[PDB]
Design an enzyme around this catalytic site. Structure first.
Site, PDB file in Angstrom:
ATOM      1  N   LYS A  78       0.794  -1.216   0.000  1.00 49.20           N
ATOM      2  CA  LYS A  78       0.000   0.000   0.000  1.00 49.20           C
ATOM      3  C   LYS A  78       0.830   1.270   0.000  1.00 49.20           C
ATOM      4  CE  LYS A  78      -0.771  -0.128   4.984  1.00 49.20           C
ATOM      5  NZ  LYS A  78       0.417  -0.949   5.287  1.00 49.20           N
ATOM      6  N   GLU A  92       7.632 -31.350 -14.487  1.00 48.91           N
ATOM      7  CA  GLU A  92       7.883 -32.599 -13.777  1.00 48.91           C
ATOM      8  C   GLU A  92       9.088 -33.347 -14.338  1.00 48.91           C
ATOM      9  OE1 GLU A  92       4.116 -34.463 -13.968  1.00 48.91           O
ATOM     10  OE2 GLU A  92       3.985 -34.438 -16.157  1.00 48.91           O
ATOM     11  N   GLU A 127       6.490   8.302   8.357  1.00 47.82           N
ATOM     12  CA  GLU A 127       7.388   7.400   9.065  1.00 47.82           C
ATOM     13  C   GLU A 127       8.728   7.252   8.356  1.00 47.82           C
ATOM     14  OE1 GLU A 127       4.173   4.562   7.582  1.00 47.82           O
ATOM     15  OE2 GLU A 127       5.482   3.275   8.783  1.00 47.82           O
ATOM     16  N   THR A 176       1.486 -43.529 -20.614  1.00 46.13           N
ATOM     17  CA  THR A 176       0.767 -43.749 -21.861  1.00 46.13           C
ATOM     18  C   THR A 176       1.296 -42.929 -23.026  1.00 46.13           C
ATOM     19  OG1 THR A 176      -0.866 -42.092 -21.231  1.00 46.13           O
ATOM     20  CG2 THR A 176      -1.313 -44.359 -20.657  1.00 46.13           C
TER      21      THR A 176
HETATM   22  N1  LIG Z   1      13.322 -45.846 -26.547  1.00 52.72           N
HETATM   23  C1  LIG Z   1      12.119 -46.244 -26.123  1.00 52.72           C
HETATM   24  N2  LIG Z   1      11.651 -47.438 -26.545  1.00 52.72           N
HETATM   25  C2  LIG Z   1      10.451 -47.844 -26.123  1.00 52.72           C
HETATM   26  N3  LIG Z   1       9.598 -47.221 -25.307  1.00 52.72           N
HETATM   27  C3  LIG Z   1      10.086 -46.045 -24.905  1.00 52.72           C
HETATM   28  C4  LIG Z   1      11.306 -45.492 -25.254  1.00 52.72           C
HETATM   29  N4  LIG Z   1      11.478 -44.258 -24.647  1.00 52.72           N
HETATM   30  C5  LIG Z   1      10.376 -44.098 -23.957  1.00 52.72           C
HETATM   31  N5  LIG Z   1       9.491 -45.136 -24.066  1.00 52.72           N
HETATM   32  C6  LIG Z   1       8.187 -45.243 -23.425  1.00 52.72           C
HETATM   33  O1  LIG Z   1       7.937 -44.049 -22.732  1.00 52.72           O
HETATM   34  C7  LIG Z   1       6.903 -44.331 -21.772  1.00 52.72           C
HETATM   35  C8  LIG Z   1       6.962 -43.319 -20.657  1.00 52.72           C
HETATM   36  O2  LIG Z   1       5.925 -42.334 -20.840  1.00 52.72           O
HETATM   37  P1  LIG Z   1       6.221 -40.967 -21.566  1.00 52.72           P
HETATM   38  O3  LIG Z   1       7.610 -40.517 -21.139  1.00 52.72           O
HETATM   39  O4  LIG Z   1       6.037 -41.099 -23.024  1.00 52.72           O
HETATM   40  O5  LIG Z   1       5.196 -39.958 -20.911  1.00 52.72           O
HETATM   41  P2  LIG Z   1       3.617 -39.826 -20.769  1.00 52.72           P
HETATM   42  O6  LIG Z   1       3.084 -41.185 -20.353  1.00 52.72           O
HETATM   43  O7  LIG Z   1       2.973 -39.254 -21.983  1.00 52.72           O
HETATM   44  O8  LIG Z   1       3.516 -38.900 -19.498  1.00 52.72           O
HETATM   45  P3  LIG Z   1       4.384 -38.486 -18.229  1.00 52.72           P
HETATM   46  O9  LIG Z   1       4.949 -37.111 -18.582  1.00 52.72           O
HETATM   47  O10 LIG Z   1       3.373 -38.350 -17.099  1.00 52.72           O
HETATM   48  O11 LIG Z   1       5.430 -39.508 -17.964  1.00 52.72           O
HETATM   49  C9  LIG Z   1       7.117 -45.783 -21.340  1.00 52.72           C
HETATM   50  O12 LIG Z   1       5.888 -46.495 -21.322  1.00 52.72           O
HETATM   51  C10 LIG Z   1       8.092 -46.356 -22.384  1.00 52.72           C
HETATM   52  O13 LIG Z   1       7.576 -47.531 -22.993  1.00 52.72           O
HETATM   53  N1  LIG Z   2      11.412  -5.069  -6.501  1.00 49.94           N
HETATM   54  C1  LIG Z   2      10.514  -5.796  -5.830  1.00 49.94           C
HETATM   55  N2  LIG Z   2      10.160  -6.999  -6.328  1.00 49.94           N
HETATM   56  C2  LIG Z   2       9.264  -7.732  -5.661  1.00 49.94           C
HETATM   57  N3  LIG Z   2       8.634  -7.445  -4.521  1.00 49.94           N
HETATM   58  C3  LIG Z   2       9.002  -6.250  -4.052  1.00 49.94           C
HETATM   59  C4  LIG Z   2       9.914  -5.381  -4.626  1.00 49.94           C
HETATM   60  N4  LIG Z   2      10.047  -4.233  -3.863  1.00 49.94           N
HETATM   61  C5  LIG Z   2       9.227  -4.432  -2.860  1.00 49.94           C
HETATM   62  N5  LIG Z   2       8.563  -5.627  -2.910  1.00 49.94           N
HETATM   63  C6  LIG Z   2       7.601  -6.135  -1.944  1.00 49.94           C
HETATM   64  O1  LIG Z   2       6.560  -5.186  -1.805  1.00 49.94           O
HETATM   65  C7  LIG Z   2       6.193  -5.055  -0.415  1.00 49.94           C
HETATM   66  C8  LIG Z   2       6.532  -3.670   0.059  1.00 49.94           C
HETATM   67  O2  LIG Z   2       5.318  -2.903   0.166  1.00 49.94           O
HETATM   68  P1  LIG Z   2       5.362  -1.355   0.453  1.00 49.94           P
HETATM   69  O3  LIG Z   2       6.717  -1.043   1.067  1.00 49.94           O
HETATM   70  O4  LIG Z   2       5.040  -0.578  -0.759  1.00 49.94           O
HETATM   71  O5  LIG Z   2       4.288  -1.179   1.589  1.00 49.94           O
HETATM   72  P2  LIG Z   2       3.847  -1.974   2.891  1.00 49.94           P
HETATM   73  O6  LIG Z   2       5.017  -2.859   3.269  1.00 49.94           O
HETATM   74  O7  LIG Z   2       2.564  -2.653   2.707  1.00 49.94           O
HETATM   75  O8  LIG Z   2       3.771  -0.837   3.969  1.00 49.94           O
HETATM   76  P3  LIG Z   2       3.861  -0.652   5.548  1.00 49.94           P
HETATM   77  O9  LIG Z   2       5.244  -1.158   5.917  1.00 49.94           O
HETATM   78  O10 LIG Z   2       3.612   0.764   5.923  1.00 49.94           O
HETATM   79  O11 LIG Z   2       2.832  -1.621   6.105  1.00 49.94           O
HETATM   80  C9  LIG Z   2       6.933  -6.172   0.311  1.00 49.94           C
HETATM   81  O12 LIG Z   2       6.163  -7.366   0.323  1.00 49.94           O
HETATM   82  C10 LIG Z   2       8.183  -6.341  -0.547  1.00 49.94           C
HETATM   83  O13 LIG Z   2       8.722  -7.649  -0.424  1.00 49.94           O
HETATM   84 MG   LIG Z   3       4.488   1.719   4.269  1.00 50.46          MG
HETATM   85 MG   LIG Z   4       4.543 -35.385 -19.660  1.00 53.66          MG
END
Ligand SMILES: Nc1ncnc2c1ncn2[C@@H]1O[C@H](COP(=O)(O)OP(=O)(O)OP(=O)(O)O)[C@@H](O)[C@H]1O
Ligand SMILES: Nc1ncnc2c1ncn2[C@@H]1O[C@H](COP(=O)(O)OP(=O)(O)OP(=O)(O)O)[C@@H](O)[C@H]1O
Ligand SMILES: [Mg+2]
Ligand SMILES: [Mg+2]
Ligand SMILES: Nc1ncnc2c1ncn2[C@@H]1O[C@H](COP(=O)(O)OP(=O)(O)OP(=O)(O)O)[C@@H](O)[C@H]1O
Ligand SMILES: Nc1ncnc2c1ncn2[C@@H]1O[C@H](COP(=O)(O)OP(=O)(O)OP(=O)(O)O)[C@@H](O)[C@H]1O
Ligand SMILES: Nc1ncnc2c1ncn2[C@@H]1O[C@H](COP(=O)(O)OP(=O)(O)OP(=O)(O)O)[C@@H](O)[C@H]1O
Ligand SMILES: Nc1ncnc2c1ncn2[C@@H]1O[C@H](COP(=O)(O)OP(=O)(O)OP(=O)(O)O)[C@@H](O)[C@H]1O
Ligand SMILES: [Mg+2]
Ligand SMILES: [Mg+2]
Ligand SMILES: [Mg+2]
Ligand SMILES: [Mg+2]
Lengths: 458, 458, 458
Positions: free
Chosen positions: B39, B305, B64, B279
Site C-alpha cells: 500500500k 515434472e 514514518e 501412456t
Molecule cells: N526408446 C524407447 N523405446 C520404447 N519405449 C520407450 C522409449 N522411450 C520411452 N518409451 C516409453 O515411454 C513411456 C513413458 O511415458 P512418456 O515418457 O512417453 O510420458 P507420458 O506417459 O505421456 O507422461 P508423463 O509425462 O506423465 O510420464 C514408457 O511407457 C516407455 O515404454
Molecule cells: N522489486 C521488488 N520486487 C518484488 N517485490 C518487491 C519489490 N520491492 C518491494 N517488494 C515487496 O513489496 C512489499 C513492500 O510494500 P510497500 O513497502 O510498498 O508497503 P507496505 O510494506 O505494505 O507498507 P507498511 O510497511 O507501511 O505496512 C513487500 O512485500 C516487498 O517484499
Molecule cells: Mg508503508
Molecule cells: Mg509429460
C-alpha cells in the site's frame, strides 16, 4: 382477524411484496448495515418515489454529507433533486458540522435538531422523514445505556408529530449484533437489516425485515442489486398463468425430432438437453434458434463458454449463417463469461435483455457453466427465477446441461455408445408433459448439414 | 441514465478496468491493508504514472519514512524520483518526526499539516495528493470516536482544495474490520482493501474495491502481484477476437494423427491430451514442439515434472536432438518446478516468456502437476487465464493432463488395454470443434522412432 | 530494472536462498516468535558466522540472560565464544538488571542504552548488531501507542550509526498478530516470523519472511530444524544436472528382471515397487542391496517397519548373509521407527547418513509407513526432498509402497491372482523412461533362493 395497521407504499421494486404493502404510517424504521451496503440511497429512493408518484413532499436530514454531494451522487441514477428543491417539494436539511470550529457537547435533539425538523415539516407539509446516520450524533459519548433514552425520545417525538420515518444506523460485523450499541433494535418498531456478505471471493447483497410490530411480513434474507435505476429487490410468488395452450405446439428445428415428441415443443414450456461433452448440444441450440427466423420471429442466444466468433465459425461449418439473420435483427448473441459477475447480476442481465428485445425463443447455453464454484442455494434460486420469468412471459426456453429435472417439462438425453471399437451416439426423448414422446432409443450423426436420427438399437 | 462523475486514470495495469475508468476527481480514497501488503508503493505508482503520462505534478506526504529511503526503495523498480524532484514536478513533503526531542499533543491538521500541504499544492500546481499512514498522527490518543472529526475535517478540507487524494491506513487482522478504529470506512467516499492472506503455507495478494459513492465498479477480490514494474493486477473480460480462421489448420507432429482429426489442429485452438501415466503424453508434446522447427517457427515447452537434461536424454532416445533446434533459437525450455511459487506467479512467468520470445506454439506439460495442493478456485482462474491469453495472441496451445474439458477444443484420449496378459495402448480423438474427427479407437506403440497408430479393436 | 539494495550474507544454511542474498545493509530486522521457537540462537549464529567467515566483529546486547549462560548455551553447538571475547572480536553487552535493587522508569534509550552501544561500535569497529528481547524494556508501561516512538527512535538511530541490526520480539499466539502490541511490524523495514505450531500431537518449526522493503524475497512458510550445528533451513530450487548418462545402466539384483526392463535400471533414477502386503517387496529390496556388494560398492537400507534382527533372520532364510557384507562395511542398516520423530527429522537423518557413508545405492523401505498419520503436504515435501537429493547426488534409489508416480522413473507392479482356489502372484514392469520394458505380465514364486519369474498369463 380485525382491522390492521394502515401502510404506506415505498414504490421500491420488490419491497412492497415483502412487507405486505409497504411501511406502517406514523412509525419509525431502522435501516442498519455495514459500510458500502446500500442504505443511504434507500432513503433517497423512499423520498423520491413518494414525491413523484403520490405527490408527497419530504425532508432529508444529513449528518456527514453536504447537500451538493448528495445531489451529485443522485444525479448518476437519472433522477434530479435540484429541480425538486427549486419547486419546494424536497428540503435537504443540513446538520453536518463545520470543517473548522469548536463544540461543547455536540448539541442536543430538542435544542435544535427536532425543532428545525418540526419547523420544516410544518413549513413544507412533508409526509416522509429520512434521518440519516443517527449514529453520528451519539458517537461523542461511549455510553451504551445513555443512547437508549436519546433514541427513545427521538422516536416518540417523531411519532407525536405523525410522520413516516426512516433511520439509518451503522454496523461493524456482518453476522454479529444488529447495530453498534445493541440498543436500537429494542427501541424502533421496525427493523430492516442489509448485508454485503463476502464468501468465496464474491460479494452478495441481501435484505431482511427483522420485525414489524402489529403486522405481518416475510421472514429471512432476500437478495437485491443496486443498478442504474436504484435498488432492485427480487421477491417470489406466482401470479396468474395462461398455461392452458395445449395446441400452439412450435417446431424444434429438426423435423425428424418433431416426428418424435408428439409434433413439436409446446410454446410455453422449458426444454432441457443433457449429456456428456462433445455430444452435440450446441448443435441442437443452433437448430432451435435458427428455426425461428423462418417464421419471422425474434430469438436470443446466451453463450457462456464460447467466443462468438467461434460460434459464427462453427455455425458456418454446419451451414447456418448467423451473420445474415443478425443483420435482419432476428437474432441476438450476448457472449458473456461466467466469472465476470455473480448469478444475481447474470439473472438481471438476462431479464433486461429479454425485456429489451421482446423475443419468442430463449436459449441459455450450458447452465452447468454457471454452476461452477457457486453455492447450491444461489444456483437453485437462479434456476427458479429464470424458469419463472420465462414461463410467465410466454417464452419457449431451451437449456443445456452437461453431465432442475423436476422443473423442466421435456428432457432430451444424449450419450455415447461404444460399438465395435468406435464411439457412436444416441438420442432419447426421456420425458414430456402432456404428449406422447416416442420411447425408442435411436442413434444420430453430426454430418455436414446437421443431425440425422437413424434407426433404433435392436 | 444521466451525467456521471468524471474520473482520473491511475495508469496502473488492471486497476482502470476494475473501477470503470479510474478514481473520481476531487474526492479522497482509503487504501487500508496489513503490514507488507503493498500500500505504500500504490501511492508512489499513482503519483509517478500521473507525472510521466499526463504531466500532472503531485505531492507526497510522509509520516514514518525519510525521503531518501523512499527514493532508494523506488530506485529498485527502475523509476527515478530524484530527477523528478530536481525538475520541480514531484515534492516529497516531510512530516515524520525527529529521532530525539519533545512534543505537546503531536501537532494538529490545520496548525501546520494542512497549511504546508495547501502551500505546496498552490506552489507546484499539483493535481494528485498521496497522504501516507494517516494512522501515524491519530495514534497518540486511543479515542476511537474523536478520530472521526479529525478524518472528516481532513477529507472535507482536501475536497475544498479540490485535488484527488489517496490515503493509507493500517489493519491488524485479515478478515476482521476494515481499519483499526472502525471509523474511516464511514467517512471516506472510496474504500480499497488489500489482503495478503495465508492459507496452506502459501501467501496470496488480492485487491478489492469496497465502495465508490455515486458510480459503479466491480465487486469482490481480484488477485495481483508485485513485480519489477510495480503492481500488476489481473482483470477479466474478453475483447474482440479473430477466431474465424477455419482454413489455417496446422499439423500435429504425427502425420498419421493428421490423417485423423480432419487434416490437422486449428491454428487458434486449445488441444488437450489426457490419460494415465506411462501412456505417452510427453511424446506427443515432443512431436508437437519439434514439428514447429520444420516450418521455421518458434515454440516454447514449459516442463513441470522433468529435469531438462532428462528431457534431452529421452528426446535423443526418440530421435529428436533438441540441442540442434535450441541452438538456432527455435526452441526454448523453461524447466520450472511446481511448488517454487504460486499459480499467479506461474501465470506471470508464462505471460512474460510468451511476450519475450514471440512464439507460434505453446506446450504446457502436466497441468495436473500444477493442480496438486492448490485450491480449486485458484486453479480454475489459472486455467482460464492461460487459455484466454493463448487464444487472444493467436497461439496454438497443447496441454497435458494425467488421469477444463468445456474450455478445450480437441481432446485426445490415451489408455491401457490388457490383452492376453499384456498391457497394450490405444488412441482416440474424443472430440473436436468444427471438424470430422475419426470416431474409431486404434492402438499405437512407442517404438524407437515414435508413435505408430495401428488398426482398430474390432 | 535498475540498481538494487546491497545485501549482507548471514551464512545460515538455507536463509540466503530465501531472502535472495542475505539481509539488507544498514537496516533493522525483526525476528519475532513465541517461546522456545529458536530466535535467540538466530542472532548468535548471525554474529558467529560473520566473525568467522568474513572477519566482521559484532556486538550482542542482552536483556534477560547473563553472558556466562549465553556462552554455556552456545558451547553445546560446538562453537566457543569465550575465545572470541578474549580476542576482542565479540563483545557481549550487558543490559539485564540486578537481581535486587530499585528503579525509576527503567532507564531510557538515549540515556545509556544507545550510548553504550554506540561507544562499543566505535571501539570494536563492529559491523553487526544483535539486540535481543527489545520487549523487555517496553514492558514496564502497557502503553501500546507509546512504544511506537521508542522503537522508531531506536531503529532510526541505529540506521544513522549505519550497522546491520537484528531485533528479537515475543508473541503469545501462533497465528494471531505478529507481535504483542501490534506496532513493531509497521516500524521495522524487515520482518521475519518463526512458528512452532502444534498439530496432531506433533510440533513443526517454520520460517517466513513477511516483508523486505525495496527488494524481493520468497513468500510463505519454509520448514527448518535446530540441530547440533545450528539452524538448518530446507529450501527449494534445482541446480545443474548431469542426467544425460543413458549408458551406465546398473543391474537390479534379479538378472531375470534385467532381461526385462531393457537391460537394467538406470544409474541415476528412482525405482518404485508397489503392491499389496505379503507380496514380496522386501525381497526385491534385499536383492537390490545385496547386488551392490558383488561390484564392491556401498549401499544403505532404511528400514521403517521391520526390526533389525528380523531382517537378518529373513535374509538368512532367503540365503543372503547380511552380517558378512556388514562386516566388510559395504552395507549399513539404520533400523528406525516412524513415530519416533517428524518427517523433517527423518529427512535430515537420511541426508546425514547419505553424506556420512557416501553410498551408491539407497533403498527406503515402506514409504507408506512414513505416510501414516502425517498431513498430505508435509509428506509431499518429504518425497520431493528425498528424490531431489537422491537424483542430485547421482544415486540409484529404490522405494517401496504398499497398496509419487509422476516423480518416479520406473514402476514395478506386484499383486495377487486367485487361480483355482489358490493365491498366486504376478509381476509387471508398468513403466520406464527411455527404455523398452517388456509389456507382458508374468508370475513368480518366492522359493528358498529368491524370485523366479515364470511364463505369462495367456
Ligand atoms: N526408446 C524407447 N523405446 C520404447 N519405449 C520407450 C522409449 N522411450 C520411452 N518409451 C516409453 O515411454 C513411456 C513413458 O511415458 P512418456 O515418457 O512417453 O510420458 P507420458 O506417459 O505421456 O507422461 P508423463 O509425462 O506423465 O510420464 C514408457 O511407457 C516407455 O515404454
Ligand atoms: N522489486 C521488488 N520486487 C518484488 N517485490 C518487491 C519489490 N520491492 C518491494 N517488494 C515487496 O513489496 C512489499 C513492500 O510494500 P510497500 O513497502 O510498498 O508497503 P507496505 O510494506 O505494505 O507498507 P507498511 O510497511 O507501511 O505496512 C513487500 O512485500 C516487498 O517484499
Ligand atoms: Mg508503508
Ligand atoms: Mg509429460
Ligand atoms: N450508479 C450506480 N451503479 C451501481 N452501483 C452504484 C451506483 N451508485 C452507487 N452504487 C453503489 O452503491 C453503494 C453506495 O451506497 P450508498 O452510498 O447509498 O450507501 P452506503 O455506502 O451503504 O453508506 P455509508 O457510506 O454511510 O455507509 C456502493 O456500493 C456503490 O458502489
Ligand atoms: N463440420 C463438422 N463435421 C462433423 N462433425 C462436426 C462438424 N462440426 C462440428 N462437429 C461435431 O461437433 C461436436 C462438438 O460438440 P458440439 O459443438 O456439437 O457441442 P455439444 O457437445 O452439444 O456441447 P458443448 O458445446 O457444451 O461442448 C464434435 O463431436 C464434432 O464431431
Ligand atoms: N544442541 C541442541 N540440539 C537441539 N535442539 C537444541 C539444542 N540447543 C537448543 N535446542 C533447542 O533450541 C531451542 C532454544 O532456543 P533459544 O533458547 O535460542 O531461543 P528461544 O527459546 O526461542 O527464546 P526465548 O526463551 O527468549 O523465548 C529450544 O527448543 C531447545 O530445545
Ligand atoms: N523361506 C521362505 N520360503 C517361502 N516363502 C518365503 C520364505 N521367506 C519369506 N517368504 C515369503 O515372504 C512373504 C512375506 O512378504 P515379504 O517379506 O517378501 O515382504 P513384502 O510383501 O514385499 O513387503 P513388506 O515386508 O513391506 O510387508 C510371504 O508371502 C512368504 O511366502
Ligand atoms: Mg451513507
Ligand atoms: Mg455447448
Ligand atoms: Mg531467548
Ligand atoms: Mg517391506
Amino acid at each position: 382477524e380485525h382491522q390492521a395497521i394502515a401502510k404506506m407504499r415505498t414504490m421500491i421494486e420488490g419491497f412492497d411484496d415483502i412487507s405486505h404493502g409497504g411501511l406502517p404510517i406514523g412509525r419509525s424504521t431502522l435501516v442498519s448495515g455495514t459500510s458500502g451496503t446500500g442504505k443511504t440511497l434507500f432513503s433517497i429512493q423512499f423520498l423520491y418515489n413518494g414525491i413523484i408518484e403520490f405527490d408527497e413532499p419530504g425532508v432529508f436530514v444529513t449528518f456527514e454529507e453536504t447537500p451538493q454531494d448528495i445531489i451529485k451522487n443522485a444525479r448518476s441514477f437519472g433522477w434530479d433533486l435540484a429541480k425538486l428543491v427549486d419547486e419546494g417539494k424536497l428540503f435537504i436539511l443540513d446538520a453536518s458540522p463545520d470543517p473548522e470550529g469548536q463544540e461543547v457537547v455536540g448539541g442536543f435533539d430538542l435544542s435544535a435538531l427536532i425543532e428545525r425538523i418540526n419547523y420544516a415539516i410544518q413549513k413544507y407539509r412533508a409526509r416522509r422523514v429520512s434521518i440519516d446516520s443517527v449514529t453520528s450524533v451519539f458517537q461523542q459519548y461511549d455510553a451504551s445505556s445513555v443512547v437508549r433514552r436519546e433514541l427513545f425520545r427521538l422516536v416518540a417525538r417523531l411519532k407525536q408529530i405523525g410522520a413516516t420515518t426512516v433511520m439509518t444506523t451503522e454496523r461493524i460485523e456482518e453476522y454479529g449484533p444488529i447495530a453498534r450499541y445493541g440498543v436500537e433494535e429494542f427501541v424502533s418498531d421496525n427493523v430492516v437489516i442489509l448485508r454485503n456478505v463476502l464468501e468465496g471471493e464474491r460479494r452478495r447483497r441481501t435484505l431482511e425485515i427483522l420485525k414489524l410490530r402489529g403486522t405481518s411480513h416475510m421472514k429471512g434474507e432476500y437478495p437485491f442489486t443496486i443498478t442504474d435505476h436504484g435498488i432492485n429487490i427480487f421477491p417470489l410468488g406466482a401470479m396468474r398463468l395462461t398455461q392452458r395452450s395445449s395446441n400452439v405446439r412450435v417446431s424444434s428445428g429438426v423435423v425428424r425430432l418433431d416426428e418424435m415428441c408428439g409434433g413439436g415443443f409446446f410454446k410455453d414450456s422449458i426444454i432441457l438437453a443433457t449429456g456428456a461433452t462433445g455430444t452435440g448440444k450446441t448443435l441442437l441450440v443452433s437448430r432451435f434458434v435458427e428455426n425461428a427466423c423462418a417464421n419471422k420471429e425474434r430469438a436470443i442466444l446466451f453463450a457462456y463458454e464460447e467466443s462468438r466468433a467461434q460460434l459464427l465459425r462453427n455455425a458456418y461449418s454446419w451451414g447456418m449463417d448467423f451473420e445474415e439473420m443478425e443483420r435482419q435483427n432476428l437474432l441476438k448473441i450476448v457472449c458473456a463469461y461466467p466469472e465476470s459477475a455473480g448469478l444475481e447480476d447474470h439473472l438481471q442481465i438476462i431479464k433486461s435483455e429479454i425485456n429489451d428485445f421482446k423475443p419468442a425463443r430463449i436459449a441459455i447455453d450450458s447452465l452447468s457453466a454457471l454452476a461452477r464454484g457457486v453455492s447450491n442455494n444461489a444456483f437453485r434460486q437462479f434456476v427458479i427465477g429464470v424458469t419463472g420469468y420465462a414461463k410467465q412471459e410466454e417464452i419457449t426456453g431451451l437449456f443445456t446441461n452437461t453431465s432442475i429435472a423436476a422443473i423442466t417439462d421435456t428432457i432430451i438425453l444424449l450419450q455415447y455408445v461404444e460399438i465395435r471399437g468406435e464411439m457412436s451416439r444416441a438420442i432419447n426423448v426421456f420425458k414430456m408433459r402432456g404428449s406422447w414422446h416416442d420411447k425408442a432409443i435411436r442413434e444420430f450423426m453430426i454430418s455436414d448439414k446437421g443431425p440425422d436420427i437413424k434407426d433404433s438399437f435392436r
